[PDB]
């Protein structure tokens, strides 16, 4: 069947022998300036001693609660922009021939009505850009009694409301069809956000290196383990 002509012919890429192959080089590339910045404005947030109030934004709601909390808010969305052409138009049909429960978008509508004493549950988004818009807010939901919670995705908060981003989206009204499932999520949030809030206050981020010295220091700790081992026994 086979042909005796054909010959397998290897290469020997060992040093000084056969021109090296083409290969995986990501890790050595000279990147542009606009990337070389952004990749090391996340390394100065593990080394550097992030203080405790900005440090509570890494604390975020998990997977089974984040896909469950956007199904109750799915029934209490604002109407579409095309719905306002059959509602405003629907007045001139019945005349010429009590709002249903919905959200509160924006920080300047949320911060007033959490202290006004109306709302039930307040939500926050994590990646808030110039950070000083929402540094004051979680300590203000601590005192009053309006339990806060953080979801990873300021993008996908302001996809409830039709826009590009948001920051905070609060509830003040819910129907009598959903009065158990809103009274349920407030208990799974409050006991680990405004009972352990105190716990939160102490917990400084930072002083945690890049491995390139974990595994030289650790290297020499074992250096003061074999001197204490063979000495004794």
């Amino acid at each position: 069947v086979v042909n005796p002509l054909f010959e397998k012919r290897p290469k020997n890429f060992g040093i000084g022998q056969d021109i090296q192959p083409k290969r995986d080089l990501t890790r050595f590339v000279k990147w542009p300036r606009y990337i070389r910045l952004q990749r090391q404005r996340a390394i100065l947030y593990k080394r550097l001693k992030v203080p405790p109030a900005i440090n509570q934004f890494t604390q975020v709601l998990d997977r089974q609660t984040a896909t469950q909390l956007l199904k109750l808010a799915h029934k209490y969305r604002p109407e579409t922009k095309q719905e306002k052409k059959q509602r405003l138009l629907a007045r001139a049909e019945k005349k010429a021939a009590k709002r249903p429960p919905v959200l509160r978008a924006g920080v300047n509508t949320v911060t007033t009505l959490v202290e006004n004493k109306k709302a039930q549950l307040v939500v926050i988004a994590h990646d808030v850009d110039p950070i000083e818009l929402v540094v004051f807010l979680p300590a203000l939901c601590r005192k009053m009694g309006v339990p806060y919670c953080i979801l990873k995705g300021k993008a996908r908060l302001c996809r409830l409301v039709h826009r590009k981003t948001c920051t905070t989206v609060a509830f003040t009204q819910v129907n009598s069809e959903d009065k158990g499932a809103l009274a349920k999520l407030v208990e799974a949030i409050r006991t680990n956000y405004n009972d352990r809030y105190d716990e939160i206050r102490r917990h400084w981020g930072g002083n945690v290196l890049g491995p390139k010295s974990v595994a030289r220091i650790a290297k020499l700790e074992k250096a003061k383990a074999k001197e204490l081992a063979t000495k004794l026994g």
Binding site: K22, R23, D24, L25, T26, F28, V29, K30, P32
Partner: protein, 118 residues
């Protein structure tokens, strides 16, 4: 899809075609080197009349911006006559003077009468 060369060069990016909304000047600027502007007056000195009967050529005066290529069709498309070659120069008074050789089947004293230079 994977890396291979240690540089970063800028990707290619689509470019449309122009498609203007109003055409900037209202009509195309007109051409003022006709046949008429290009040929001025025939030159008729002792030494031009020595270059008609003898050689079988003519002597012209010509808009200084004029090509040779341009001139050669303007002598072609007004006296009707086909050309061999059109030498030029530029005088110390500052105008263009083209020496116009002619064809053997054509004749030089004979066409010269038609126009007026004798």
């Amino acid at each position: 899809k994977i890396r291979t060369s240690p540089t970063f060069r800028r990707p290619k990016t689509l470019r449309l075609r122009r498609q203007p909304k109003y055409p900037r000047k209202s009509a195309p600027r007109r051409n003022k080197l006709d046949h008429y502007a290009i040929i001025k007056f025939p030159l008729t000195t002792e030494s031009a009349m020595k270059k008609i009967e003898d050689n079988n050529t003519l002597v012209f005066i010509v808009d200084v911006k004029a090509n040779k290529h341009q001139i050669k069709q303007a002598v072609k498309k007004l006296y009707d006559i086909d050309v061999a070659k059109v030498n030029t120069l530029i005088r110390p008074d500052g105008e263009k003077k083209a020496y116009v050789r002619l064809a053997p089947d054509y004749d030089a004293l004979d066409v010269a009468n038609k126009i007026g230079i004798i």
